[PDB]
Amino acid sequence: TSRTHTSEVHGNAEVHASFFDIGGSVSAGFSNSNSSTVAIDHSLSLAGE
Amino acid sequence: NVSPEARHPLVAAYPIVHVDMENIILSKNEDQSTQNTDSQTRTISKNTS
C-alpha cells in the first residue's frame, strides 16, 4: 500500500518579441497530487539442488 | 656360565641385571578429516504485479 503526496513549486517564463505587439509572460506554479497506489503480487519458485 | 672367579666356595655367585633405555618413541593420537562438496541449483520463478 502506498499513498503519495507530491507537492510542487515552480517558476515559469515566456516572451514573444515582435515589432510592436511584443508579449511576455513570466509565471510560477504550485501543485500537489494525492496518489494512492496499491499493488498485488503473486509469485512462485521451483528450486532443485 | 658361572664365572670362574665364583667357583670358589667363599665367593658368591649372583646376577646383577639392570635395564637401560636407548630410545623413546611417542606418537600423537589425533585424527584428521577432509571433505569436498559440489552443488548445482536451478531456480525457475514467476512474478505478477
SS3 string, chain A, reads CEEEECCEEEEEEEEECCCCCCEEEEEEEEECCEEEECCCCEEEECCEC
B4 φ, ψ (degrees, to nearest 5): -65, -20
Experimental method: cryo-EM
Distance from CA of B36 to the nearest CA of A (A): 16
Our CA dihedral for B19, B25, B28, B31, rounded to 10 degrees, sits at -120
Are A5 and A31 in contact by the 8 Å Cβ rule? The answer is: no
Task: Give the span between the Cα atoms of A21 and A29, in whole angstroms.
Answer: 26
Task: Give the span between the Cα atoms of B44 and B39, in whole angstroms.
Answer: 17
Indicate yes or no: CB of A43 within 8 angstroms of CB of B39. Answer: no
Resolution at which this structure was determined, Å: 3.4
Distance from CA of B33 to the nearest CA of A (A): 25
Paired with A11 in beta bridges are A28
User: Which residues does chain A have within 8 Å of residue B42's beta carbon, measured at their own beta carbons?
Assistant: 47-48
Q: Residues near A49 by Cβ (< 8 Å), separated by ≥ 6?
A: B39, B40, B41
